[PDB]
Design an enzyme around this catalytic site. Sequence first.
Site, PDB file in Angstrom:
ATOM      1  N   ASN A  76      20.586  82.619 -48.896  1.00  9.51           N
ATOM      2  CA  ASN A  76      20.676  82.979 -50.296  1.00  9.51           C
ATOM      3  C   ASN A  76      19.228  82.983 -50.806  1.00  9.51           C
ATOM      4  O   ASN A  76      18.306  83.166 -50.018  1.00  9.51           O
ATOM      5  CB  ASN A  76      21.580  81.995 -51.084  1.00  9.51           C
ATOM      6  CG  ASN A  76      21.327  80.518 -50.724  1.00  9.51           C
ATOM      7  OD1 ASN A  76      20.235  80.127 -50.290  1.00  9.51           O
ATOM      8  ND2 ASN A  76      22.340  79.690 -50.926  1.00  9.51           N
ATOM      9  N   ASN A 154      14.464  59.081 -29.105  1.00  7.31           N
ATOM     10  CA  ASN A 154      13.146  58.960 -29.673  1.00  7.31           C
ATOM     11  C   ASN A 154      12.411  57.777 -29.039  1.00  7.31           C
ATOM     12  O   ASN A 154      11.660  57.106 -29.727  1.00  7.31           O
ATOM     13  CB  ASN A 154      13.263  58.766 -31.190  1.00  7.31           C
ATOM     14  CG  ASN A 154      13.963  59.932 -31.869  1.00  7.31           C
ATOM     15  OD1 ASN A 154      13.871  61.089 -31.424  1.00  7.31           O
ATOM     16  ND2 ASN A 154      14.694  59.639 -32.931  1.00  7.31           N
ATOM     17  N   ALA A 168      23.482  62.043 -24.520  1.00  7.13           N
ATOM     18  CA  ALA A 168      22.698  63.199 -23.987  1.00  7.13           C
ATOM     19  C   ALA A 168      22.666  63.103 -22.485  1.00  7.13           C
ATOM     20  O   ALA A 168      22.674  64.122 -21.780  1.00  7.13           O
ATOM     21  CB  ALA A 168      21.274  63.206 -24.515  1.00  7.13           C
ATOM     22  N   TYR A 170      24.862  62.222 -20.247  1.00  4.75           N
ATOM     23  CA  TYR A 170      26.032  62.756 -19.535  1.00  4.75           C
ATOM     24  C   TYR A 170      25.826  64.226 -19.171  1.00  4.75           C
ATOM     25  O   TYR A 170      25.360  65.015 -19.991  1.00  4.75           O
ATOM     26  CB  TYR A 170      27.283  62.633 -20.416  1.00  4.75           C
ATOM     27  CG  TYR A 170      27.663  61.203 -20.680  1.00  4.75           C
ATOM     28  CD1 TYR A 170      27.672  60.257 -19.648  1.00  4.75           C
ATOM     29  CD2 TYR A 170      27.989  60.788 -21.966  1.00  4.75           C
ATOM     30  CE1 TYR A 170      28.015  58.935 -19.899  1.00  4.75           C
ATOM     31  CE2 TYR A 170      28.343  59.470 -22.221  1.00  4.75           C
ATOM     32  CZ  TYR A 170      28.345  58.550 -21.195  1.00  4.75           C
ATOM     33  OH  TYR A 170      28.679  57.262 -21.498  1.00  4.75           O
ATOM     34  N   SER A 220      16.902  64.256 -33.138  1.00  2.13           N
ATOM     35  CA  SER A 220      17.981  64.524 -34.099  1.00  2.13           C
ATOM     36  C   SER A 220      17.831  65.805 -34.891  1.00  2.13           C
ATOM     37  O   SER A 220      18.838  66.407 -35.266  1.00  2.13           O
ATOM     38  CB  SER A 220      18.012  63.423 -35.155  1.00  2.13           C
ATOM     39  OG  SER A 220      18.709  62.302 -34.667  1.00  2.13           O
TER      40      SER A 220
HETATM   41 CA   LIG Z   1      19.421  78.721 -48.647  1.00  2.00          CA
HETATM   42 CL   LIG Z   2      23.831  61.968 -15.557  1.00  2.00          CL
HETATM   43 NA    NA Z   3      23.119  65.911 -20.410  1.00  6.04          NA
END
Ligand SMILES: [Ca+2]
Ligand SMILES: [Cl-]
Ligand code: NA
Length: 274
Positions: A76, A154, A168, A170, A220
């Site tokens: 927008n 981090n 993460a 896995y 993140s």
């Molecule tokens: Ca916007």
């Molecule tokens: Cl793994």
């Molecule tokens: Na992974």
Amino acid sequence: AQTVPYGIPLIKADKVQAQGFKGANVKVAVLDTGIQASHPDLNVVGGASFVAGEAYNTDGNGHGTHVAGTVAALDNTTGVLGVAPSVSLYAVKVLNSSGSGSYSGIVSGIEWATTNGMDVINMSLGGASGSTAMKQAVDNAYARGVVVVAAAGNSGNSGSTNTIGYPAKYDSVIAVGAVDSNSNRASFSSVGAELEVMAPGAGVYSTYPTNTYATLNGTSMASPHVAGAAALILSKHPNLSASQVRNRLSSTATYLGSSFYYGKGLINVEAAAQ
Ligand SMILES: [Ca+2]
Ligand SMILES: [Cl-]
Ligand code: NA
Ligand SMILES: [Cl-]
Ligand SMILES: [Cl-]
Ligand SMILES: [Cl-]
Ligand SMILES: [Cl-]
Ligand SMILES: [Cl-]
Ligand SMILES: [Cs+]
Ligand SMILES: [Cs+]
Ligand SMILES: [Cs+]
Ligand SMILES: [Cs+]
Ligand SMILES: [Cs+]
Ligand SMILES: [Cs+]
Ligand SMILES: [Cs+]
Ligand SMILES: [Cs+]
Ligand SMILES: [Cs+]
Ligand SMILES: [Cs+]
């Protein structure tokens, strides 16, 4: 007017949006501190809260609102612009207002997302250990066709040490590390065998409560770029499996250096979605 955060052209998300692909009718679940649903630059279409005392559509932290905006801030004349500004955004609150959660809240969020036909799950969260049920929830989500994305962590580097977090870590889940606007790895970004791709994570400007815009650093902030990039690919090639969407983001990334530090490199959604 509308600011376009540097991460948008850096992953070439802007080139795919100009071809007219914006992630329309792709359903993306942000598993986080919730989302400030009343924000003028976000449209939250549904969700669920697994957090005692807090409804899915409020965010007393700010983290989930900011992660949602990087996926889907509306296109927008105001605010920011998300990677996939036409997605159907679901707020799945699995983290409390102090920014943390239980393994069973997270697990329940994953299951809610799989049960409700989400196409993409973003998890801008991580812990050192994970759980047996978390593993199964991500595995089942992936095997059912959901693209699952999570922040690598981090914890930075320390010699040869793997510092990738769960979920993460896995292999069902894409582990996203962080770069800055010069495409260099940010120092806090976790490293290791499981690191899969990089996305922008230092100096990321997005939606933030109440009704404002803020800059944060973390893997993140990187994860939602990859979650939005998945939604762009799916809006353009609607019949791809999760494996296929994941393989495209991977295999077309811009190599940056050692995969230990950068995985396959910086996502390029133009190359991925072609
Ligand atoms: Ca916007
Ligand atoms: Cl793994
Ligand atoms: Na992974
Ligand atoms: Cl905190
Ligand atoms: Cl170090
Ligand atoms: Cl570099
Ligand atoms: Cl590997
Ligand atoms: Cl297929
Ligand atoms: Cs709104
Ligand atoms: Cs709802
Ligand atoms: Cs707070
Ligand atoms: Cs602005
Ligand atoms: Cs799969
Ligand atoms: Cs460190
Ligand atoms: Cs070490
Ligand atoms: Cs790696
Ligand atoms: Cs699909
Ligand atoms: Cs290479």
